[PDB]
Amino acid sequence: AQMRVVAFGDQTYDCSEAVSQLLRVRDDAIVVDFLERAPAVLKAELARLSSEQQEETPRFATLAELVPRYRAGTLNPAVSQALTCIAQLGLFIRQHSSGQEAYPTAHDSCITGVATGALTAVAVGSASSVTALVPLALHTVAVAVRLGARAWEIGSCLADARRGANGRYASWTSAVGGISPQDLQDRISAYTAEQALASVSVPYLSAAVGPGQSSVSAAPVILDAFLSTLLRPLTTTRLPITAPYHAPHLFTAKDVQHVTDCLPPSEAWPTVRIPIISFSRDEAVSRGASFPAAMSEAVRDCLIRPIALDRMAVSIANHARDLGKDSVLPSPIALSFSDKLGPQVNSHLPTSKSIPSAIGAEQQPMAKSPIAILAASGRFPQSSSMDQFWDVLINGVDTHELVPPTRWNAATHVSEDPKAKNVSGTGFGCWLHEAGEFDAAYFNMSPREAPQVDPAQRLALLTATEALEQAGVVPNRTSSTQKNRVGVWYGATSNDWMETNSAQNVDTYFIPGGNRAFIPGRVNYFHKFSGPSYTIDTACSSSLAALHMACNALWRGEVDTAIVGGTNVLTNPDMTAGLDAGHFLSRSGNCKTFDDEADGYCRGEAVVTLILKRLPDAQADKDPIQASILGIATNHSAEAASITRPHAGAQQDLFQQVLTETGLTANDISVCEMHGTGTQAGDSGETTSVVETLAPLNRSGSAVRTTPLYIGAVKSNVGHAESAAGVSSLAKILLMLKHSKIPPHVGIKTKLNHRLPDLAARNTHIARSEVPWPRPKNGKRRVLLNNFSAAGGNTCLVLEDAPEPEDSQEVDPREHHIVALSAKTPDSMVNNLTNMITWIDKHSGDSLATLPQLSYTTTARRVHHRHRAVATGTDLLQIRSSLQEQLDRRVSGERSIPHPPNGPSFVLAFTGQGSAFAGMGVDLYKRFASFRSDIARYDQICEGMSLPSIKAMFEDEKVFSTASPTLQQLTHVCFQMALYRLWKSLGVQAKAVVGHALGEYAALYAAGVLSQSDTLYLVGRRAQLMEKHLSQGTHAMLAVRAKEEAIVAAIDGPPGEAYEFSCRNGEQRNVLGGTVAQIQAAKAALEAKKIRCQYLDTPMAFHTGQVDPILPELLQVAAACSIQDPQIPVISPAYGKVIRSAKDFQPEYFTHHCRSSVNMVDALQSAVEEGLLDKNVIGLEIGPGPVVTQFVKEAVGTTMQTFASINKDKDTWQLMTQALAKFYLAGASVEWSRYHEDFPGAQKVLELPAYGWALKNYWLQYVNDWSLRKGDPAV
Amino acid sequence: AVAVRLGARAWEIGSCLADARRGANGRYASWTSAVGGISPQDLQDRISAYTAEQALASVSVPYLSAAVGPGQSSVSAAPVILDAFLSTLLRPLTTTRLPITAPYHAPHLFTAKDVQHVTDCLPPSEAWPTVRIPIISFSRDEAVS
Amino acid sequence: LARLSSEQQEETPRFATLAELVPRYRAGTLNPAVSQALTCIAQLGLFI
Predict the structure, then answer these.
(1) Nearest to A1042 by CA among A1099, A1096, A1074, A1088
(2) Is the dihedral of CA A315, A318, A323, A324 positive or negative?
(3) Of A431, A755, A1032, B61, which is the most exposed, with the fewest CB atoms less than 10 Å away?
């Protein structure tokens, strides 16, 4: 008997943190859809207004850029009103969709609101769902802006803007305390009488709060004058109410009517179903009123009637009593001093947990989500990898140097005083000396084609590929990695390759090799990604602009995975001569950021590709996550003097724009990666914007910051990468996060820039030497990043630490593991082997979980090419020893030939029930899933057919002792079909099948003749027939090592009278059956001639005259089957022949089979004579023991490879890993994701060496300095 | 999620109950057909007898999947088995082939084990809502639940 | 669908949204697991 009250606030509550934490919401689609939508209905009603509103109308790109001007007081009443309303609705829409909180209903809840909250309250009371709240909620946004707008009309009319305002808008309202509302009203009246003031300009009591508290509104000049007359002990405190409200003398009914004219007339408007507590009226409760009428009435509360906040508490309580509720929950939304409400309402009157959901549901949706950065690879100056870049930064390395001769000759292109045309004042740069290296074979390029391709394209392909492997991305492996859900976006400032290098001789691959669009395109073509492809040029912000587009794609659901990168490689001296002509470039050296003498930026080269994914998909696929991007934003510096220099106002508004969109405050960002281009103006301007955003000073003068800020610029090291500048900065932070250190700042060579503000006073710092920067316990480190452009587009993002990696305590019980290596060239294979050995030597003793996670990583998360190598062992040392030996053989001249496209050929051998044993197949049954399903299936199916239950045979070993013939027989057949399903699932497709006796029934399923369950009906019914008619022990079977001729000559009596041949297995291997007396006599006759003879455990004598009575009924049950043509040939011992047609599987087959001898020799010879079997075929025993493979082996040759699935002696996974190794090397497609699926401890992505590239230098030399003579004749 | 696991399990038991024919071309055949002009119990008797002459496996048997009306009903079975059984039903009887691509409503095929398997995607918890609006379950002992 | 068996996957196609399975659902080439889920999506979609 509890009643929750939803209470909304007024302008006094600061919604900057509110709105901030709203655009953090990624946990529901209706929140972001509504919040994004709010500007639309808003702007739809923003245009019908007066002219003065069009004068001082601030700029706002989204609901974010309003925040800094809100805190600064430079935001008007119309928009600040709408902003508060949006924030209130957003928090509600959050809490009731994101927050899994039920929607208000008239029985258990009521609504209340103060000023803006009243408008908000109408909307919540009028809907039956959040989804139904959305449109009404927007109509309320339009009402809110027209409310604040009209208030500013009349308020501007009463008094205009003050001279000392400087854009800040003064507050029309003030809170008074220490006096009763009535006594203060008397003081107002007295002041009115004593001073000469108009009837409209008079002060008035705007609100009644408490016994000693209230609020008074007048003019900033008038209100100041009145408040100056109120002396201590009374209190006076300011409030952000920027227009006159609650003034029945200033406003009338026409103003209310007008504010609500944005609501079209209709009869379908929903009514107010939840009672709203309107406490400032005669009627405390109002329900059932239509939405427009309710809105106009709420507008009248705001504009006309005074707030009576002393009547709010009891007003709620009265209604609580009306419905017979003992107490209330407060649920305040953006309500000033909300904490004290609950006690106040309960004074008049006489426990939560989250609801989990499906795996991936309790978290946020897959539409919008804090995008995780999975991996990043790149090539940077003096760095072939991200790790060498960390070495550049942490050691304070400065990489600038004169242009190398590979690009152009500085002696002719550089002079201290450029005079001649196309000559520059600088030749400095931070260069990629390896940019020509590339592997043409990996990417299917001819040595003719690979030179003509831009280094941006080629290194984009390399870095992209590497980033994919680092993230363990296999196309079409998971939902997020499906080929049509993957996008690419790359920033590029110029293609100098086609302007300078390939331009000397144009050919067919000139345009494929030179246009910027192929940079992302080529990546999509190689990996077969059918998602979007784009190149972005915002100049020096290009990469972050591309990142922004990519983040938007993941945010709108356009792609699951996004590939983001940037490329800068400069082969063209003109770009130097022109940028230098524009005074952009430093003629002394690198970017010196913050240095008191900074003359420009130094060009640099970089190539980066990253992998981005929605966090739901990221965590779902167990991908690595180095960090997570909360958000990002872009504006343009329109207010600039010049096209050249972006200015600080736009930049600051953009910093708070991302702090809103992301949802944090200054104190949360502990480090800022600035876009420092080594300019006195740029550096001072940007620093001022950064500290004013992230390190403010209160009005008293102290620092707002509780923790330290550390500011730096990557450009002071590797120079200015232009398009790739943003990704370089981002690259820096990904490593800084990894190693938990801030590298030194080398930009200050001589003296700090004197134009900067005092950094120490605001707790900004420039780390000169490395500083410990550890992760707060149960917290996350957060960073602000920048990259800007001369083209004025400014872009920045906020980056946050990755989630906490879950601690998997389940240890892999598997003893033996398998490691899979692959490559496209023998050299590349040698490289990968060497690099893997060195990696094992690094991590040899770290942990035991390393080997399962290595197998999972190297297998399920890797693409597998034609050259392949494998190692298998119980610990990392065995793996190393194997890879080392095989590496030694490759270095010694062993040729690596790729396997054929078809792969190895297979014949599957199914054994009879003779060699079956207790606890057969139990380990696979315990640990695996699909096999368990197969067995459980056979159990429910057999229980449905009135056959015994087989599940107990694999659950428990004891039951094998007392098992009946039918149970053992069904268990055997079920075992073979489930086993065959497993091997079929692992990628082994059979060329033909051969069974022996009972194994052929599984062969009929494997061939496609019979279904599984039907096979169990036939076999089971047959066993019941054998138990029904025959008797155990009367007959027996004998295994004999000798030829048929010798056996016949040895036994007195012909075959078919004194005995019968049950099986003809091999040349000298035969089996005899008959009555016990016949077997005894035959055994003596054979032993007399020293022929080795041994008995079978078979109680009956199969394939002899014994089974005559069961054949008629077995014929009917053989007609019970539905027969189909075999999909592959069936080697039939029954008829001694290879059958391809269903005509021979007619019901007579199963009778013939039961009675007739099993001729393996005749069937196998028939198979080899057809060419179906030869030495190159690989036999695989599906069954308890290798009795049949030895017969096949005898038939075709001694060198045939045969491998058995199950054997009593050894451990199952040794056989498994060892078996998979041969097929994977000989070629096959094995599903590795399922091999590790039931072992979560093994599922993690290790950082392993990148693919060993077979690299060659592909380059077209720029020669003869022809760029200096542009426009001149030949001469 | 329960639906995709349901259809996946039923298709898995199509695979266990039979394979695809040669004339499919990727098309998945109909494992159910509607019969008319006969009462449900009489058709059940014809199922018993036609089966009994061939003694078809109680897994491969054509089974009565639905009782529609006094003369209508639906029978399910294999494209070869079903078409063979349907071939014995002659005019005035009607046969309309339905677009159901896996076997359902088969107590001789499924048990509680598979049912539980289908719903294993629902994590355990004590907070799951109950059924507040009555569901009319007409194929059970209790019409209302 | 990734938790399925090999026969349940090799014949399962790629799709981003539910639009690509429409023509093939008309053509009767769609598996029971997806067509089952599709019918369920349709029913819920119309009710919502």
Answers:
(1) A1088
(2) positive
(3) A1032
Q: Which chain B residue has its CA at the smallest distance from C1's CA?
A: B4
Considering only the beta carbons, identify the residue of A483, A984, A1237 that sits closest to C6.
A984
Classify A404 as helix, strand or coil. coil
Question: Which residues does a chain break follow in chain A (C to N more than 2.5 Å)?
Answer: 350
Q: Does B60 contact A1120 at a Cβ distance shorter than 8 Å?
A: yes
Residue A1020's Cα: distance from chain center in Å? 50
B140: closest CA of chain A, how far (Å): 20
Chain A contacts to B (CB-CB under 8 A): 353, 355-359, 933, 936-937, 939-941, 943-946, 1008, 1011-1014, 1016-1018, 1116-1117, 1119-1122, 1124-1125, 1127
The residue of chain A with its CA nearest to that of C2 is A478
Cβ-proximal residues to A723 (8 Å cutoff; 6+ apart), any chain: A491, A492, A493, A537, A539, A540, A542, A543, A566, A567, A568
DSSP character string of A751-764: -B-TTSPPHHHHTE
Query: Which site among B4, B15, B17, B59 would you substitute to test the A interface, given the most A Cβ atoms closer than 10 Å to its Cβ?
Result: B59
Q: What does the block give as tokens for A444?
A: 């299917």
**Chain C neighbors (3+ CB pairs < 8 Å):** A, B
d(CA A1026, CA A1111) in angstroms, rounded, equals 10
Distance in angstroms (rounded) separating the CA atoms of residues A764 and A755: 15
Read off the tokens for A762: 């605001």
Instruction: Scan for tokens 């082939």, then name that residue.
Output: B97
What string of DSSP letters covers A434-475? Answer: TTTEE-TTTTT--TTTGGGS-HHHHHHHHHHHHHHHHTT--T
Quick count: other Cβ atoms within 10 Å of Cβ A641? Answer: 8
Q: Taking a C-beta distance cutoff of 8 angstroms, is the pair A837, A849 a contact? A: no
Catalytic residue among A675, A864, A867, A1103: A675
Phi, psi of A865, deg, nearest 5: -95, -170
Q: How far apart are CA C19 and CA C25, in angstroms?
A: 10
Q: How many beta-carbon pairs below 8 A join chains A and B? A: 88
- Could you tell me the CA-to-CA distances from A215 to A184, A210, A250, A299, A475 in Å, in that order? 9, 10, 17, 20, 65
Structure-block tokens of residue A1163: 């069937």
The experimental technique behind this entry is: cryo-EM
Residues in chain A, total: 1275
Q: What are the structure tokens assigned to B137, written together?
A: 């379950």
Q: Please tell me which residue in A319, A527, A720, A972 is annotated as part of the active site.
A: A720
- Under an 8 A CB cutoff, do A1017 and B59 touch? yes
Residue A217 burial by CB count (10 A; 0-12/13-18/19+): exposed, middle or buried? buried
| Secondary structure in 3-state letters for A207-253 | EECCCCEEEEECCHHHHHHHHHHCCCCCEEEECCCCCCCCCCCCCCH
Residue A776 preceded by cis peptide, ω within 30: no
Structure tokens at A378: 């790149």
Query: Could you confirm whether A899 is annotated as catalytic?
Result: no
To the nearest whole Å, the CA of B143 is away from the closest chain C CA by 23
Closest Cβ–Cβ partner in A933, A1013, A1124 for B17: A1013
Nearest to C33 among B7, B27, B99 (CB): B7
A229: exposed, middle or buried (Cβ count in 10 Å: 0-12, 13-18, 19+): exposed
Contact (CB, 8 A) for A694 and A706: no
User: Resolution in A, one decimal?
Assistant: 7.1
- Selecting among A540, A672, A974, A1154, the annotated active-site residue is A540
Are A615 and A364 within 8 A, CB to CB?
A: yes
Output the CA–CA distances (angstroms, integers) from residue A1009 to A893, A909, A1150, in the order listed: 49, 17, 13
Nearest to C31 among B3, B6, B11 (CB): B11
Please indicate whether, in this complex, the C-beta atoms of A478 and C2 are within 8 angstroms of each other: yes
